[PDB]
Symmetry: C3
Subunit: 369 residues, 3 copies
């Protein structure tokens, strides 16, 4: 039929757009379906910026984690007393708290910058706004909302200087071209206290799962990553090779919003739903760059890569999650069922079952076909 778990990149709507770039926000997941109530406070944003461009300073009333999907950026985060600028490469993530100003430079000369954000609103479930201190074609300065006298006392200056220096619309919108020299100066302080936390490499150590057909890196809510711990969340980076298949599996407790960063493939997701009688229903999707889908906890999925597929996953309800497989040797929960219980449940004997299950001696990722 159709698939509530699949949001093609056409379901994103641009919030700000121009020659320089565009910030698109995926619709609220519970506008879709009541199945995604638990996911309503998580909005996905994708930013694309051209070379030598900057997304201008803003803060949001939402807690953010930002990931570089493609290219090189310098991201700067500021609070009331401090600032930190980080050179980020693809696969590096950075948390940006609510109310902290940030801006994003595309460091690269010829490559576009693609960035994925998960945004967690603080005031109203599933809704947030960006607050820009400068004016532009797309939006006014929030300082304009203050009265003339309030502004005059605040800055200790007349309304005329303030407006001309700060308030005026200055036009190309919220993503702007930057000179070669200016990019040099914006990058000067960059790194390759105060809740301004350092970036993390999603691919930092060994992958949890690795074979000739596929790779899975994961950062868990850990003593190692207290921020993830505070948010009960994990960050996952999957690489499936062209012609490979990630075996049927599921996450035991985590719900995962998956973004497709590069490549093409085919999603299989199995659910149990009410017609009283409960039926297995299969859901499929032709995955493409920019797409998003939702992997609910405990629901089987398998993914087939028609080209090299790169998937970034934001997990919710992460703590103690187990990614459990249904085939192959490693992490195979069916293997773990007692023989005698295999005999009673399946049509084959326990011996047949165990024999058939051991046919597949590879784990996790295999050759499609």
């Amino acid at each position: 039929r159709n698939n509530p778990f699949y949001f093609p990149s056409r379901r994103f709507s641009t919030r700000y757009g121009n020659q320089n770039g565009r910030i698109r926000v995926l619709q609220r997941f519970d506008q879709r379906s009541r199945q995604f109530q638990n996911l309503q406070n998580h909005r996905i944003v994708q930013i694309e910026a051209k070379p030598n461009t900057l997304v201008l300073p803003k803060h949001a009333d939402a807690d953010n984690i930002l990931v570089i999907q493609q290219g090189q950026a310098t991201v700067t985060v500021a609070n009331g007393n401090n600032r930190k600028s980080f050179n980020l490469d693809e696969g590096h993530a950075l948390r940006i708290p609510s109310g902290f100003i940030s801006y994003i430079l595309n460091r690269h000369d010829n490559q576009n910058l693609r960035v994925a954000k998960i945004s967690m609103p603080v005031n109203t479930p599933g809704q947030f706004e960006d607050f820009f201190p400068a004016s532009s074609r797309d939006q006014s300065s929030y300082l304009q909302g203050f009265s003339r006298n309030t502004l005059e006392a605040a800055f200790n200056a007349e309304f005329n200087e303030i407006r001309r220096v700060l308030l005026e619309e200055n036009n190309e919108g919220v993503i702007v071209k930057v000179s070669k020299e200016h990019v040099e100066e914006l990058t000067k302080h960059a790194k390759s206290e105060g809740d301004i936390t350092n970036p993390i490499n999603l691919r930092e150590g060994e992958p949890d799962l690795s074979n000739n057909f596929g790779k899975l890196f994961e950062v868990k809510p850990d003593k190692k990553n207290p921020q993830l711990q505070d948010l009960d969340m994990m960050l996952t980076c999957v690489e499936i090779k062209e012609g490979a298949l990630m075996l049927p599996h599921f996450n035991s407790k985590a719900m995962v919003i998956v973004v497709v960063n590069k490549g093409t493939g085919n999603l299989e997701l199995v659910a149990v739903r009410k017609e009283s009688n409960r039926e297995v229903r299969r859901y499929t999707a032709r995955l493409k760059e920019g797409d998003v889908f939702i992997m609910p906890a405990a629901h089987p999925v398998a993914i087939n890569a028609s080209s090299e597929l790169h998937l970034l996953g934001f997990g919710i309800n992460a703590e103690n999650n187990h990614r459990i497989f249904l085939a192959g040797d490693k992490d195979n929960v069916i293997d773990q069922i007692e023989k005698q219980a295999k005999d009673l449940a399946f049509p084959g004997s326990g011996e047949q079952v165990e024999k058939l299950i051991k046919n597949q001696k590879e784990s996790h990722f295999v050759s499609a076909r």
Copy 2:
């Protein structure tokens, strides 16, 4: 009138049933009443299985705690890399995480098995499904939802072997008869790492409250029981003797779903509700085996046993809960009011009040009448 806090066992609906057993699920508590919004993510399940039967392997997209209400079971829990089987007797509880496969054997020869489950959905508030890897009359294997080619690559075998060994409906449903010998072999590994946590005896130590008329055991969210701590929940086992009355009391912060495992009795629950004017309303219930009722925090209740009454309680919002009484010597909050404040609030003097309150020198449970 009628009672929103009381769910007679007729309000359970069978999800799977047969000669062997039946799994009944109590309706969603907020389908009832908006008073139970805080309880919407908790569904109660009761399983009854006959001797020498097994509930077949399944996982659910819900976090579970299971309690033995009557009889002897062997419960096995499995994840991707591990398995543990436990002989459980009445009063023993076991947590089964989301996405972990389990199955339930009735160890006993002639006695039925009664099991109570509280299920906490992960994907959609108040709704969950069971996922069976084998097919049957009642439900299909979720492997059927995968494509032929996906299955063939996964198991490294043709569709024909897979379907015949695994996929085929093999019929008597999800609870099956088991041979005397097979029960021996399923019990072989049983006990009388990996988030597979051991069972707990609800009645393990001394009871918190004990007297000739009644008993109350409780397991609290504790350093001793970190799982309970993580879930902010407690598990309570009450025994009220025939002809006894549990004194008017309430839990200070916890909301408790109470299941009646054995016996008969009479529930009194007092609420304050809006007609502006606030009025005391009394709610009553003839308690019987299988019944469920809801004890909201801070609402007075008293229970009268017409036969020996056994009650199992699942507490939510447990941490720092106080079960506070309104009569008797122990835990009597009215006693604790200053004399002078007693004098000002009640019609009697402070002296009379204190005199009348000390008439009852027993605590918690007394003789009804």
Copy 3:
């Protein structure tokens, strides 16, 4: 137009009232607006009692923090096994758990007592009831909801003694006049274990922010204040001098319900809202004694005092909150933006911007005008 963030004290409704005092409860914040869903479980109560009066014993099915806005009280908290009485002065807060009985004496001879409460319901989001063990004109004893036989067994006495001593309506309502001598005796045990936690002085140490124009004390969720830690909440006390202006600022993650305890002023709050196009909208309010308003996270606000203004703030989502300013020297996030990024976003050069920003060498609070 009109202002959803502003609740004038006329929006409070009295729940109990009389010559002695009145308890008014502010309406549910989400009856207002869907913007305040995250604030639905927080109800504000204001109590005013005349000299030598007592609010009678009650418990609620809500967790409470109580603050003295004006005057002197003795507040007593009781559970099943213990009692503690505290002399509270203005600026002192006290937590009262759900289900714990409390009562409030106005210690003072000629001064009225004003008390602010934030109430966090436990059973049903945004709704709670008070449970009085004594009867009165305004409400019945909850003991009346128990049957005659239940009561007789409980207290070990006949229905006649019980009713006359305890049950009878004894009339002036829930706030009562108290003799000079009785106030002496109710104060005897007062202080100037068991989850009965001591009061805290909101103004206890140094203020976080201090200058000739203004003061801000804050108690944070801290190892120092584990209760606040458990609730993820902070308590804030602001003093703005007559003719002063608190500079444009916002809280990075916290949402704050602010109560006006004394004085008059003018609130400016800036939001971003949808007309697609996002626009700055300004919201204003003439603040007066008793008023409440809501400061959502990340939304700019400035406050102007026309007389000496005292504001008490209940923060939600507190942990790691940053109160960030937009002008002045201290805590100015705009200062923190890189010069080159200032140059690109604002109309003025980076130099002008930085020059104009340094015009204001005071921090936080300045002279209005």
